[PDB]
Design a binder for this molecule. Structure first.
Ligand code: HEC
Ligand code: HEC
Ligand code: HEC
Ligand code: HEC
Ligand code: HEC
Ligand code: HEC
Ligand code: SF4
Ligand code: SF4
Ligand code: SF4
Ligand code: F3S
Lengths: 182, 242, 961, 158, 156
């Protein structure tokens, strides 16, 4: 209600003189606290130890046929969940039934259904790279999402591809209620 | 109690001000505050607050009640002989005084009450302000005789100022017929009582260093006599004893 | 009412890093002609604290004092904002066009450098890529405080250049011979420290222990944590070592050491070393002529120890003779032969004695070009002064001392526009545009990678791992057969010794504008903010000066020492350790600094001068007097001919300790291996338990049934699982004094000024107090002890009881955590505690803190406001991020998932910190050890950090006494 | 949210694993507002910001002081929802911060938790009515999951 | 403060029974450890390293009655059940966790590898961009035994 910044009497230690990440820094050109890193720098614990598990550009061939990790369904649990938060928005919960954005009459590029056979036989390391690096019209998401999620998401996809090539098809979708909002 | 109450004012400012964060001292009070927080009652710095915030009050209310017949007298004079007709209207602190039987008996037992009910508080106020020292682990403080001692210090300090006020309240603006010099005579005994009761403790301090002290408490009082503050303790004890 | 302080996140998200959580980049740290390893936190690509590289076995995860202050050198104010030409801050873009046109069409051009000592292949290879074009590049490595002098003594001894490594775990008995092997001033401070400490670490009722025999000329930190130390003027330690070896059997050698045939400490150790062949060591310090180091080679070869003094062949670098080049440089300055003068990281106007002139030549020559970090005395006198990057923006390469071949991760962009790191500048001289150091550096490795995997699997691996593994030079054998035996008669005498020596907290003044280091007590004497002269009472009582104090502030006389008509004065302080006719004047501390920021006056109603330590100027001004120019550059640590003049201006000198020499008190309780062999229960015997009552820890109070540990509300959290405690293997604790500085950076603090600390307040939480113990003042044998003292976070805890405003509590796990919010400042939190460790934010030092250092205070802890206490907290901050990380995912806390700052920095693995009630951890082994030294346990306090005593190890008789 | 059906982990990433979860970068809007709208006079700051380096000048709310730290992941992974603490955002054009986020309310959960905590199955569901027999269905998790909330000074104030 | 103390009194009982069933298991393992590693290790501190917890675990049983009976005696104070339950589960999960840390060393010497089924073994916090701990807690919970740790070593 009280539309202004409210009265806090003792401002001694609210806004500490030091500044945490994602906070204003009144020194630099870009008013910002992060000061991003120089290229080439490397952490202590995030080397591309096993390139399969971090990349698909893994052998002389730049893509990988299969998931390297032994895949329990608990990995796929995150796959389902992680799909329906930052990947079912557009490709949709069913892959082909396009999500709210594309079914929303908008100026966006329509994406291909995962159920198309051209996607049902692809190097899984590529579909991984689709997340880490992006595609012609589509952004990346591995810029922000964890990398194990980049795998769990794929097992759900490759399983969701295996929905088709079987008569477990035509999943019910709740999109219309989302177009309305109520 | 003037000489007490104003001392308590210029006293209480220090606990409010030798702290660094004055503004955040209302947390010390047991108000149900903006969160589920309350003070710590194992702390004599808090006992000091309730004590002085009661001792400013009880000594006042016992002084204010002490001076009701004055306001009666002055309210009675303001009409017939005094400053103004509107000093009477200022003297409503009389609180409908007439000096009657029905409540004067009560005034006596109340003056008895606060006498037997502020002394148990006085012996707790300065004792609290001594408990803050002696409760500690320091050897020069943990010695247990201090609360009676500092109290005797309060005697041997307070009357040591009242006489400074009475002398100067006896020369120019004085009451030869009411402030009899025989009063100050019988006054300095209860000073001189603590002129020696204060002295006996210095012996105990200076004794227990030789009797069963920690090897630090052994050193703690050798410091007092021999060390940086030889200017203080040699002359101080001698000043307060000679 | 409050502000609306915004949040400005990324735009072009770097994928690896994330906002809230740091991630550890693996840099290096150059100094003194070598490069310690390191490991940063790098909160969102901003460095906040440095740490050790646990993979690199040379260090095994440790960081001495000299690094953590460099972290603040990075974030200094008044560094190199603008490029200065002539002294004017004019502009950069003209300089590149200028210097480029100078460089490409130059020809001969006769340039000179006066570099910082390289210790890196990119530098040494670019030197060749440079010298390919321009004819004569004199290329003097101006070593700080002249030639290292450990190496020049050995180029003839072995016939070729070489450096040693000095294991000390395979070796027990060590005659130091002035060697500050355990000295933060010296190099390889870890491997000297650790495997020496392990020799001192017993974990048994008796074990074989080092038993060094130090014979220093000036009382130094290595001589403290030591046994049978001796005081003997430098310039005569050669005469000491002369009669030494004659009592061992190498040669006659009698004439130099004329008067030490039958000295006790000589004839004592001689039989021992010959009796300890594969275990005895003979070191040699830096205050000598090089024949001492020949003797360090002759006897140590003859002694039989080669695997114990591990020896390693440098890359053909013997040519570091300070006379041979630096004079020979200015001999070309005065002839107009040399034109350009490309300084890199140095202040030779500050340094570089007048006996061999520099400034007289500097003003002769134009085209001067000083690359530089500060602006001190060389920028002001040059015609071009580049700004310089710190090593954090260099892409530098660098060798660890004598071993591996590391490489820096640069963490932050150049904080200041146009910093232009020295390496690419040195390549900017190579007739091209400014070489991208990222691509420049890489071009060397392919010629020298020595790894069959290509870069993007090797470069990524080394930039990750912090060290190129297989490197480390090949190990030479015995070359000497008594070659270097012909520079003896330099044992000259007849005058006061004026020896120089670098304090652990500063190194040739190159890190003076550095508060964490500048307000760092020296370990010898808790001195801060002034250079000094330390000496004996017998000379003082024969000279006429004192360290008198009638206010607990140490008012001090002066000296006005005078060498060749180049006299200056300084405070004289006194120590009962040093010998006759000798003073150890420490360097740095006289380094004039020129400020860009204002003095920041505020009204007289407001305090700024006492708080604004960065106000009156930058830091390095007037903190002491400059002393480097006085010496003679021949054996350029020592000096004669100081016509002392006890003059006036007798001003203050400030310390934290302010005193010393406990009166036989139970605070260190040293003990012998003889006594330790007799009564392992002696840490308690000083104040044992009572007539028939329990052992002291776990001793019941009056209350045991209503004790809060028996009540739920203290017991009910996600914490009681792991009680925390922090022992200290005091046997290896000597005044490294890095136990402090990591506390200062991890759990942030402000600094304090001379004008303020004089009244005795210092916001260093971890006191590192030293103490002296003599045999009731028998021969004035000091026999020091050092011991840190954080807030042993008690159980009974008087302080907790006493905050009325409940700003203290025995938090779960022995932690007694302070809150910097709830307190009010009545300070009786502190007065209770026997250990006056509840420091107090007296003034608001952080409010006056500038827009530069604020990068440094780490973004995880509560910086504190005026009127608030503070203390150790066991570096709780990294308990929280760990225990929280275990609350997410069900787990315990490992033996080493968490490492405190006092732990992770102390290179001697003294502090261990592993959670109590977790029996597999090191603490339960180090607490269950016999000497669970419980400091002032007698007050029934029951604290954690139940640390250990020292066991000094004397010698059987052997004519010792 | 209310008519695009996004859950909260999309652009408020690092709330499951971090402490003090992030407001998104500008890049997130560039996932879709690079080529979905390209018209409005409402976010020319955004398009320019991706085309420049000045990040989006975001104000914030809920700014409890920076001497009392906090961690969403410590809560969210252990089953606490945004309806309880940050309010029902699904119909919120601009943030009301309907909860105070002060200590006296911050602590009512750490003394009386089981009135609030979620089963972790679809925690970010603004239209969540909990079941009946909610409490006893929850305490069986505190008995098993063993959460043991904090009551002390050590937790957030340091 | 929903409905008083009597609600929580069912679950606090459900904790103490887990302890009582673990009196059997811990003391059973204390037999088995003496049987499994008779002489395959130092065992002189290391067996008593496992016993030292046991006198504490049994001591808390008599307490868990006293803790609990102080609650069920008067059900009119909600600010004791949440605390007694927060104490029990911590004093319980600790002793479960302390048994494990002493029991994983058993495998650490019998097997040269303290197994990859040891702990969550997730990693540091900056190893969340690759491996959120969410994955790890579903590894640790669904793989690691609380007190089937040495009976697991009967398979070895
Ligand atoms: C899912 C259940 C949650 C989401 C999504 C978010 N929160 Fe939290 N939250 C809380 C506080 C007191 C803060 C302020 C942080 C600080 O000042 O240090 C926050 C912060 C956020 C933010 C960003 C705003 C910021 O940078 O300060 C976001 C996007 C956010 N939260 C989303 C409090 C709580 C809380 C009560 C315990 C809960 C359960 C959550 N937050 C959970 C969620
Ligand atoms: C979330 C995790 C995902 C996943 C698994 C995929 N996408 Fe997309 N995507 C979008 C569009 C418009 C395209 C077409 C690009 C073009 O026409 O040039 C794509 C492309 C793909 C592919 C095809 C790659 C190939 O093998 O040829 C795949 C496998 C794929 N995507 C998977 C649009 C979007 C979105 C709209 C904003 C979002 C969100 C995503 N994609 C996210 C994902
Ligand atoms: C991106 C597409 C978003 C989605 C989907 C959700 N949030 Fe949001 N949130 C976003 C931004 C850019 C901001 C900044 C506020 C502004 O000034 O516009 C926010 C804000 C919040 C906040 C308040 C944070 C603050 O500014 O102090 C909260 C608590 C929050 N968001 C939570 C939240 C939840 C629970 C969501 C899904 C249920 C959600 N957000 C959607 C970006 C985006
Ligand atoms: C794809 C998933 C989207 C992401 C990611 C973000 N937004 Fe969005 N936004 C999206 C749509 C389909 C719409 C239009 C729906 C409608 O009701 O018209 C919007 C709308 C907005 C608007 C309103 C524009 C106006 O009315 O002037 C704004 C201000 C907006 N979006 C902002 C915004 C920001 C700042 C985002 C990242 C933090 C963001 N959106 C993400 C689809 C998507
Ligand atoms: C429910 C309504 C909660 C509110 C409101 C707050 N917290 Fe919480 N917190 C909650 C639970 C259920 C738990 C325990 C989870 C477990 O498995 O242990 C917690 C725990 C914490 C911790 C844990 C300690 C740590 O990991 O560092 C902290 C620091 C914490 N909570 C902080 C916190 C703050 C600062 C809050 C309000 C400002 C707050 N919590 C509210 C549940 C709830
Ligand atoms: C979270 C885990 C907390 C716990 C447990 C405790 N405190 Fe708290 N406190 C917390 C917050 C987020 C706030 C901010 C409220 C506001 O006013 O905006 C506070 C507040 C205080 C204060 C007042 C500070 C002020 O600026 O007014 C005090 C003095 C304080 N808290 C003390 C305190 C103590 C002593 C606690 C246990 C020992 C404690 N708090 C618990 C967060 C949390
Ligand atoms: S414990 Fe402290 S003083 Fe001792 S060596 Fe380590 S850092 Fe230095
Ligand atoms: S030693 Fe001092 S700071 Fe440490 S717990 Fe005890 S009283 Fe508190
Ligand atoms: S724990 Fe931190 S604050 Fe405490 S003494 Fe050690 S390093 Fe310093
Ligand atoms: S006594 Fe207490 S109120 Fe603060 S100043 Fe000290 S912790």
């Amino acid at each position: 209600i009280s539309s202004k910044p409210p009265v806090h009497p003792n401002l001694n230690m609210d806004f500490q003189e030091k500044f945490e990440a994602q906070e204003l820094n009144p020194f630099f050109a870009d008013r910002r606290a992060m000061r991003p890193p120089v290229p080439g720098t490397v952490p202590r614990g995030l080397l591309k130890e096993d390139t399969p598990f971090y990349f698909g550009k893994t052998a002389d061939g730049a893509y990988v046929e299969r998931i390297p990790v032994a895949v329990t369904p608990e990995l796929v649990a995150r796959g389902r969940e992680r799909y329906n938060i930052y990947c079912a928005v557009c490709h949709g919960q069913a892959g082909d039934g396009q999500g709210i954005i594309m079914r929303g009459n908008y100026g966006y590029t329509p994406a291909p259904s995962f159920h198309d056979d051209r996607l049902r036989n692809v190097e899984d390391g590529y579909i991984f790279d689709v997340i880490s690096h992006g595609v012609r019209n589509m952004p990346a998401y591995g810029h922000q999402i964890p990398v194990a999620d980049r795998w769990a998401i794929v097992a759900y996809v490759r399983a969701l591809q295996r929905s088709q090539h079987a008569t477990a098809a035509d999943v019910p979708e709740e999109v219309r209620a989302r177009l309305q909002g109520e | 109690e003037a000489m007490t109450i104003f001392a308590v004012i210029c006293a209480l400012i220090f606990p409010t001000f030798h702290v660094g964060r004055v503004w955040a001292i209302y947390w010390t009070l047991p108000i149900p505050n903006q969160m589920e927080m309350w003070p710590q009652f194992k702390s004599p710095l808090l006992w000091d607050v309730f004590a002085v915030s009661s001792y400013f009050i009880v000594s006042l209310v016992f002084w204010y009640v002490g001076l009701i017949p004055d306001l009666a007298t002055l309210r009675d004079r303001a009409a017939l002989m005094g400053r103004r007709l509107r000093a009477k209207i200022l003297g409503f602190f009389a609180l409908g005084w007439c000096g009657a039987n029905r409540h004067w008996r009560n005034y006596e037992k109340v003056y008895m009450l606060l006498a037997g009910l502020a002394t148990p508080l006085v012996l707790s106020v300065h004792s609290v302000v001594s408990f803050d020292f002696a409760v500690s682990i320091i050897p020069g403080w943990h010695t247990t005789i201090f609360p009676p001692y500092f109290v005797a210090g309060a005697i041997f300090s307070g009357f040591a100022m009242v006489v400074t006020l009475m002398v100067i309240a006896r020369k120019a603006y004085g009451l030869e017929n009411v402030i009899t010099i025989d009063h100050l005579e019988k006054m300095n005994i209860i000073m001189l009582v603590t002129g020696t009761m204060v002295g006996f403790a210095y012996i105990t301090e200076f004794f227990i260093a030789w009797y069963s002290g920690v090897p630090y408490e052994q050193y703690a009082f050798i410091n007092r006599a021999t060390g940086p503050y030889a200017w203080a303790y040699w002359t101080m004890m001698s000043c307060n004893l000679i | 009412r409050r502000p609306v302080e915004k949040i400005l996140p990324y735009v072009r998200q770097p994928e690896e890093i994330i906002p809230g959580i740091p991630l550890y980049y693996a840099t290096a740290m150059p100094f003194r002609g070598s490069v310690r390893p390191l490991l940063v936190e790098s909160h969102e690509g901003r460095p906040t604290k440095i740490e050790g590289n646990p993979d690199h076995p040379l260090s095994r995860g440790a960081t001495g004092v000299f690094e953590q202050a460099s972290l603040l050198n990075l974030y200094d104010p008044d560094r190199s904002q603008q490029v200065l030409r002539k002294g004017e801050p004019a502009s950069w873009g003209d300089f590149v066009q200028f210097a480029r046109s100078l460089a490409a069409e130059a020809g001969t051009k006769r340039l000179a450098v006066l570099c910082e000592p390289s210790s890196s292949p990119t530098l040494a290879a670019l030197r060749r890529e440079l010298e390919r074009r321009y004819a004569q590049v004199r290329w003097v490595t101006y070593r700080p405080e002249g030639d290292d002098h450990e190496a020049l003594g050995l180029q003839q001894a072995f016939g070729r250049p070489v450096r040693a490594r000095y294991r000390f775990s395979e070796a027990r008995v060590i005659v130091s011979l002035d060697a500050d092997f355990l000295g933060p001033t010296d190099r390889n401070f870890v491997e000297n420290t650790r495997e020496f400490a392990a020799s001192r670490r017993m974990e048994r009722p008796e074990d074989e222990i080092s038993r060094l025999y130090v014979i220093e000329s000036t009382y130094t930190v290595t001589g403290g944590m030591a046994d049978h130390r001796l005081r003997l003027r430098a310039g005569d330690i050669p005469a000491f070592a002369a009669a030494l070896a004659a009592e061992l059997g190498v040669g006659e050698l009698r004439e130099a050491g004329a008067r030490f045939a039958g000295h006790p400490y000589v004839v004592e150790i001689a039989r021992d070393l010959r009796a300890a062949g594969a275990r005895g060591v003979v070191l040699a310090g830096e205050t000598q002529p090089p024949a001492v180091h020949a003797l360090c080679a002759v006897i140590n070869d003859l002694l039989g120890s080669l695997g114990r003094t591990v020896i390693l062949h440098a890359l053909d670098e013997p040519a570091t003779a300070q006379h041979a080049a630096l004079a020979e440089l200015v001999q070309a300055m005065q002839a107009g032969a040399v034109d350009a003068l490309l300084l890199l990281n140095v202040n030779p106007v500050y340094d570089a004695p007048a006996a061999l002139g520099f400034a007289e030549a500097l003003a002769q020559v134009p085209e001067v070009i000083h690359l530089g970090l500060h602006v001190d005395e060389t920028a002001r006198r040059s015609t071009w002064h580049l700004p310089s990057t710190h090593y954090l923006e260099a892409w530098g390469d660098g060798r660890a001392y004598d071993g591996t071949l590391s490489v820096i991760q640069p963490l932050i962009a150049p904080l200041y526009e146009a910093a232009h790191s020295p390496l690419e500048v040195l390549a900017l001289l190579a007739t091209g545009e400014e070489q991208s150091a990222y691509d420049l550096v890489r071009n060397t490795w392919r010629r020298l990678l020595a790894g069959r995997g290509a870069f993007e699997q090797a470069w990524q691996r080394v930039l990750h791992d912090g060290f190129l593994p297989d490197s480390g030079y090949p190990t030479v054998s015995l070359r000497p057969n008594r070659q270097a035996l012909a520079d003896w008669p330099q044992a000259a005498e007849g005058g006061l010794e004026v020896v120089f020596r670098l304090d652990p907290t500063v190194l040739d003044g190159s890190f003076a504008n550095n508060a964490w280091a500048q307000e760092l007590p020296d370990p010898i004497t808790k001195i801060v903010w002034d250079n000094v002269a330390i000496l004996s009472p017998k000379t003082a009582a024969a000279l006429g000066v004192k360290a008198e104090y009638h206010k607990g502030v140490y008012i001090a006389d002066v000296i006005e020492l005078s060498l060749d008509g180049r006299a200056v004065e300084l405070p004289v302080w006194v120590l009962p350790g040093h010998p006759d006719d000798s003073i150890t004047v420490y360097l740095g501390y006289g380094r004039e600094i020129t400020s860009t920021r204002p003095e920041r006056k505020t009204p007289f109603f407001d305090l700024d001068d006492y708080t604004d330590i960065y106000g009156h100027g930058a830091i390095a001004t007037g903190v002491g007097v400059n002393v480097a120019p006085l010496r003679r550059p021949d054996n350029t640590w020592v000096a004669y001919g100081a016509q002392v003049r006890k003059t006036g201006r007798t001003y203050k000198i400030v310390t934290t300790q302010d005193h010393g020499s406990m009166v036989g008190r139970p605070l260190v309780r040293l003990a012998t291996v003889e006594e330790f062999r007799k009564n392992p229960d002696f840490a308690k015997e000083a104040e044992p338990p009572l007539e028939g009552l329990e052992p002291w820890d776990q001793y019941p109070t009056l209350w045991e049934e209503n004790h809060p540990s028996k009540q739920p509300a203290f017991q009910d959290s996600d914490y009681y699982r792991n009680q925390w405690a922090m022992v200290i293997d005091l046997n290896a604790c000597t005044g490294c004094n890095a136990c402090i500085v990591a506390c200062d950076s991890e759990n942030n603090i402000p600094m304090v000024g001379k004008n303020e600390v004089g009244r005795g307040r210092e916001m260093h939480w971890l006191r590192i107090d030293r103490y002296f113990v003599s045999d009731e003042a028998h021969a004035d044998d000091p026999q020091i002890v050092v011991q840190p003292v954080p807030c042993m976070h008690c159980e009974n805890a008087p302080c907790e009881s006493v905050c009325p405003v409940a700003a203290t509590v025995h938090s779960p796990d022995g932690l007694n955590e302070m809150v910097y919010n709830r307190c009010i400042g009545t300070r009786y939190c502190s007065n209770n505690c026997p250990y006056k460790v509840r420091r107090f934010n007296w003034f608001n030092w952080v409010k006056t803190l500038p827009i530069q250092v604020q990068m440094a205070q780490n973004p995880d802890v509560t910086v504190r406001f005026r009127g608030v206490m503070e203390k150790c907290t066991y570096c709780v901050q990294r308990i929280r991020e760990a225990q929280r990380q275990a609350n997410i995912e069900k787990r315990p806390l490992r033996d080493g998932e968490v490492k405190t700052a006092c732990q992770q920095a102390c290179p001697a693995e003294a502090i261990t910190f592993g959670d109590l009630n977790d029996p597999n951890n090191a603490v339960v082994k180090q607490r269950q050890n016999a000497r669970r030294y419980e400091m002032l346990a007698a007050l029934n306090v029951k604290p954690r950090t139940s640390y250990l005593a020292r066991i000094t190890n004397p010698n059987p008789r052997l004519l010792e006494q | 949210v209310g008519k695009l059906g996004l859950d909260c982990r999309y652009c408020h990433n690092w709330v499951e694993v971090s402490d003090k979860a992030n407001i998104p970068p500008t890049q997130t809007c560039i996932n879709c507002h690079s080529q979905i709208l390209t018209d409005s006079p409402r976010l020319q700051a955004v398009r320019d910001s991706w085309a420049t380096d000045r990040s989006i000048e975001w104000v914030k709310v809920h700014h409890l002081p920076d001497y009392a730290h906090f961690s969403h992941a410590s809560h969210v992974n252990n089953g606490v929802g945004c309806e309880t603490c940050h309010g029902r955002i699904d119909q919120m054009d601009v943030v009301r911060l309907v909860e105070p986020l002060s200590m006296g309310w911050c602590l009512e959960c750490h003394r009386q938790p089981e009135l609030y905590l979620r089963p972790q199955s679809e925690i970010t569901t603004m239209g969540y009515q909990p079941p009946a027999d909610y409490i006893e269905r929850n305490l069986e998790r505190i008995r098993k999951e063993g959460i043991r909330p904090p009551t002390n000074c050590s937790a957030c104030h340091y | 403060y929903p409905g008083g103390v009597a609600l929580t009194l069912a679950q606090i009982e459900a904790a103490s029974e887990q302890v009582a069933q673990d009196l059997e298991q811990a003391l059973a393992e204390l037999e088995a450890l003496r049987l499994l590693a008779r002489r395959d290790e130092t065992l002189a501190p290391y067996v008593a390293q496992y016993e030292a917890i046991l006198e504490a675990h049994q001591q808390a049983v008599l307490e868990f009655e006293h803790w609990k009976e102080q609650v069920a005696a008067h059900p009119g104070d909600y600010r004791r059940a949440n605390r007694t339950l927060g104490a029990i589960t911590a004093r319980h999960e600790a002793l479960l966790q302390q048994y494990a840390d002493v029991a994983w060393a058993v495998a650490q010497h019998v097997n040269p590898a303290l197994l990859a089924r040891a702990y969550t073994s997730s990693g540091p916090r900056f190893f969340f961009y690759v491996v959120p701990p969410q994955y790890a807690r579903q590894v640790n919970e669904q793989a690691v035994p609380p007190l089937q740790v040495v009976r697991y070593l009967a398979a070895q």
